[PDB]
Design a protein around this ligand. Sequence first.
Ligand SMILES: [Cl-]
Ligand SMILES: [Cl-]
Lengths: 386, 386
Amino acid sequence: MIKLCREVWIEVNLDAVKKNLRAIRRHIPHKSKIMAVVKANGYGHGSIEVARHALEHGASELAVASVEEGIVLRKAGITAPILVLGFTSLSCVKKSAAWNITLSAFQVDWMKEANEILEKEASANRLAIHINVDTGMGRLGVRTKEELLEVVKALKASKFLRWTGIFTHFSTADEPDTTLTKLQHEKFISFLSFLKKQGIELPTVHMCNTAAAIAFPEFSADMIRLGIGLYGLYPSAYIKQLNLVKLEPALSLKARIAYVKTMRTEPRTVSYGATYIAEPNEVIATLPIGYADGYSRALSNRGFVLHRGKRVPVAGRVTMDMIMVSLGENGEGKQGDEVVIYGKQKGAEISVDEVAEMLNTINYEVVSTLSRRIPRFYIRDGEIFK
Amino acid sequence: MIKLCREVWIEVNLDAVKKNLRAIRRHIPHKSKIMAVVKANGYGHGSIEVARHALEHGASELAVASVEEGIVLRKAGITAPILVLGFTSLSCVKKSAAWNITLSAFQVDWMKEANEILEKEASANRLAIHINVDTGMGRLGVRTKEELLEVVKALKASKFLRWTGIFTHFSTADEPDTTLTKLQHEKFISFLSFLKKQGIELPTVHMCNTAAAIAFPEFSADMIRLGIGLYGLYPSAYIKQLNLVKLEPALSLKARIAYVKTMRTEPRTVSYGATYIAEPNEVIATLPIGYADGYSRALSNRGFVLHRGKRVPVAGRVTMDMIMVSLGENGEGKQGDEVVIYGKQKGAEISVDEVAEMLNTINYEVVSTLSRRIPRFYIRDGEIFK
Ligand SMILES: [Cl-]
Ligand SMILES: [Cl-]
C-alpha cells in the first residue's frame, strides 16, 4: 500500500478541508468572497493539492508569501488571481507582470519606477496592485491619510499599472479584549471615506483573517483571507471557546518500527550521553524520525508516541534521524508495527495543540516546520493518491 | 550582484571545507581513509556541492541517512561508494542493487530474504553490506559475540551479497569522562579477536566520529567518519578546548531591509499580541525571514541581528515570514541595506554556537533545520555560483 525505503510519512485528509470551507462560507455574509492562504508550502501541508481543491469548493483567489511561491502554482495549471503578501523587489516587476501575479505596494516612488520599467518594454501585461494600509500591525504599509492620497494619485496616472484592491491587518483579533481591534477598524473606515469625498471610486476591500471572520463577521466587506482555519486548527484557545464554527484537523504523522530488542547483556546504556539505563528485562524499539525532520530535540526524555492504542515514552536523547522508545518490561512488539506521532489511533490522540503547549509555542509553528524530506499522501473520498 | 524577489539567502564557503579536511588528514595515521557524512541535506548546507568538493580533496566514501538521499547524489553524477546508516526495508532491495548503494544489516533473517529476492530475479549486481555492532549506543546493531558469528556465517553462505565493512558507534566520546569510550573499544576489539580465531578474514573496520578522531587517533583503524568537523563546528566545548585541531566555519545567513519608518502617528504597537510599543522618534525596520524558514519563534523579544557592524534587537513577536527590529531614536538606515543573521560583519559576529546556547540545544539542530525555500549560494576561491 505505502512502500518506502525509510518508513516515515504524512497524510493530508482533503475531505476535512472541504468541510472546513463549507462551515466558513455559511458563517460570513453571502455577498463576501474567500481568499485562501497557502504560503509556506500550504502551512506544511503542500501548496499545490490544497489550492486546487480549495478553488473547486468555495474560494476564488489565493495568497502567497513571494513571487516564487506563486509561479509554482501557475506551472501546476492554476489561472486564479494570486496576491503576494510581503515586499517584492523592483527587479522582479517584469517577471510578475509576465506571470500575472498581483503585487502589494505602498510607496509613491515604487509606483513610478515600476511603471517606467513596463513602459521601456511594452507587452499588454498591465501589472495589478493591492495597496496595504498599516493601522496598528506596524510591519508594512502606509500610515497617514495624506500619504495615502499621494499614492492613489500616483497610481491612477500610471498607464501600465491597474488598481484592484486595498487592505489592512488586525494584530490582536484572537484575544478576548477587543479594544485594539475596534480602534483599527475605525481608522480604516475613516481613511476610505476621505478618498470618497474627493470623488475616488474604490476597488475590492478586504481586512479579516480566520479569527476576525469567526469573531466579527460584519467586517467581511468584499473579501476575507482564510488561513489556519482551512487546515482544521483554531487561532487561539479563546476562539475555540466561542463555539461558533466546527473545524476538523487535516494532518497526521506516522512511522513503522525499525528494530526491537531486550537489554539482557551489558552495558544497558541508550543514546547520546547515556542519559537512560534500561532494566535487564526492558524492551527497546527504534523509530526512523529525528530532529532534522522537525521533531524537536527538546522532546528528549519527554515526548510520547502511540503504539497499539497506547502512549509509550521516548527513552534517551533525540538524534538527527532516529528516536528510541520503551515498551517496558515484559515487552510486546515487532519490527514493522505502525506508530502514530501526531494524530489518532483507536481511541487515543496526540494532537498538535498538545505538542505546541508542551514546547511553549503555537500550532502554526509545529506544522509549518515539517521538512520537505517527508513524503505527503492525500486522501480524497476515502481513497489515497499523491 | 545577488538579485532576488524575496531578499534572503545562505552563503556556504567551500575554501573553508577544504581547510577542515587538511587539518584532519595531518592528525590521523596515513593508513586510514576518510568517509564524509552528508546526510540530512548535508547538515543543512546542501548535499550535492559539498559531496563534490569533499571527494576532490581527501574523502574516499560518503554516508547518508536513506536510499532516497543517496539517489539524489547518483543523479548528479557521483560514482563513489555510499553507505546508508539507518534501517532499509526489504521493499528497496532490488532498487539499491540497481543504483549500487551499500546498506547496513545485522539480522540473519533479513540477510536470508535479501539474498532470495536477488536470486529469483537472476541479478548481475551484488548488494554490498556493512555489519553494525552495538557495543553501548543501544540504537541498532548486533549485541553478543555468538550471534555476530551466525550473521557472519549467513552472509558468507549468500552468493548475491558482498561483505565490505564492520563498524560500531561511540556514545560519549565528546565528554571528559572517558570510562565508557575505553570500555566499548575493549568489547569491539575482543569480538574481532573472537572472529579471527576461526580463520575468518575481516574487511574494512571503522569506529570513529569527529570527536573520537580528535581525542583518540589510535582508534582510526582502517577508516573514520567525519561529520560535523567537515562543516567547521566542534562536537562539544570540551573537545574545542584541547586545542589539537583548527576548524573554520562554512555557513552564513543574510538578508536585505524591506521597509523603514519613524513611529510618528498612533498607535505605536509592533507585531502580534502588541508586546512592544515604540517611542515617537523610534525607527523600525522590517526583514523578510520568519519561523517557517527555521528562525525559532522563541527568539521573540530576545535575539539580535547585525546592521552596519552593530548588534540590534528583535522588536515584538517573530511571525511566519517576517521579523521587525529597532534602530533606536532617529536611527540610521535605508530600504535595501544588508543585514547578517548568522555570521560575521565588519568587526562583529553572531555565531551558530551562541544561538544554540540561547535556545538550550546543540549546533547540529540549528543548521540542519534551515528550510529549503531559502536559496544557497556557494563561494570557492572567493567568488559566487548557483
Ligand atoms: Cl502587514
Ligand atoms: Cl547505530
